[PDB]
Design a binder for this molecule. Sequence first.
Ligand SMILES: OC[C@H]1O[C@H](O)[C@@H](O)[C@@H](O)[C@@H]1O
Ligand SMILES: OC[C@H]1O[C@H](O)[C@@H](O)[C@@H](O)[C@@H]1O
Length: 483
Amino acid sequence: HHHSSGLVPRGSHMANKAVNDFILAMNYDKKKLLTHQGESIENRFIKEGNQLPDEFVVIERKKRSLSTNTSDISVTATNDSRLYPGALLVVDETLLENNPTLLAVDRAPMTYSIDLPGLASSDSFLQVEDPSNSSVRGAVNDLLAKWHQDYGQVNNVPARMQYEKITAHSMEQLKVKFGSDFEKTGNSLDIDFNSVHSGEKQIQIVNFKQIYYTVSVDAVKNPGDVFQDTVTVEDLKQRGISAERPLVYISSVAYGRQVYLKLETTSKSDEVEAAFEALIKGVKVAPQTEWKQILDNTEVKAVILGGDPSSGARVVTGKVDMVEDLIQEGSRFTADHPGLPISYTTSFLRDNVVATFQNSTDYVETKVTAYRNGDLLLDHSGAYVAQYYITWNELSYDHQGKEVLTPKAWDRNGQDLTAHFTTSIPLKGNVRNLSVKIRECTGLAWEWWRTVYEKTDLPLVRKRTISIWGTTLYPQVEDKVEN
Ligand SMILES: OC[C@H]1O[C@H](O)[C@@H](O)[C@@H](O)[C@@H]1O
Ligand SMILES: OC[C@H]1O[C@H](O)[C@@H](O)[C@@H](O)[C@@H]1O
């Protein structure tokens, strides 16, 4: 097969065979090529207390790490010309970053299969003579319009739903969860991370993928097979291809609609998970209780990557009312609109093993505990002098995370008071060891003062009215709580 000149003729099968041998000969570490380790910052943390309007919150810190390992690459962009089934990609830092470098060299014909419901055998294959985003998308769209006319109109299809959620802490941890390129849509979601670590909010992120169809490509027998005879080893080298920087092809793409949902509540109820969940499922088993209180304190921002004209709606549907709306909009697929790429997978060209990526990060999980403010009300309408001795500790946290309890005492402590006297003592959630003592002067020489109330560590509640009344010999007291 050798040519007299000793050259390898561009465009000959010998050219393509050298390419095939070039790739087959590459040795590399799949593990090390596709691995990212974030930052190992696993120090020790400080305990802290934060007073805010209607409550006191203690912020505890715990040590967690998030690790992911998947062959599935989620798509953010809406019109990426690099992301078509069969596309050749380079394995780079840029592939890990979901911003890949495409290898646009002369492509050989390729055959694809779509897995659309109600579609037979031979009608599920598409032949694409010169694979590119345009030509492959053009091929499926043709088929879709056909399918649309003898199924998707008639039959409710519907779509394949995949739900996935997490509690937002860092952008970095959101990246390991949803993809290296999540920052774009995370930044559109307005995720107030500040107020998460500062106790003021709890945020969760949920991803809804609705899959209309998937198109994919059979394993390739020879690495050579994807190139025209015009492509040569020199060309691959000119474009930086080597063992150190080998290549994958995308072996399937999932098309449909996908939404990202930010559920942001003010309620530190650290029992938000269920109230968010029931809102997702839309089960509505008596929304006028505890779950209702927190769902009424939920802001919602959503980024939608629909089956519609390719662009992302960034809408802030505001209230949780318009969440069922979203899970419903792309529910059925009729083939009136081909959805867009929602996720894709890649396989090494050398040998077809699917490339799985490995991401990790350490992040700070912040637990939040809320102690609500209350008021202590006092009512004195007895025919006697009384004195109160009201006492407590206000709790705070010093750098070093130790418990600081500084003692306090009501100002009018010890004063004689007579009827009718009423006051109202605001007690913030950081108060501990409440003591209330009330004595009354009976006028008896032998029992000058009688204590009519004496409690310690009086539980802080939203509302406590201690009323006293009656006479010097028959005082009456009521300890009324309201929560
Ligand atoms: O505590 C002072 C007390 O003095 C008398 O009892 C009345 O003038 C009351 O209304 C007042 O509350
Ligand atoms: O010595 C205690 C004395 O304090 C005040 O002067 C009055 O309230 C008296 O009635 C009370 O008994």
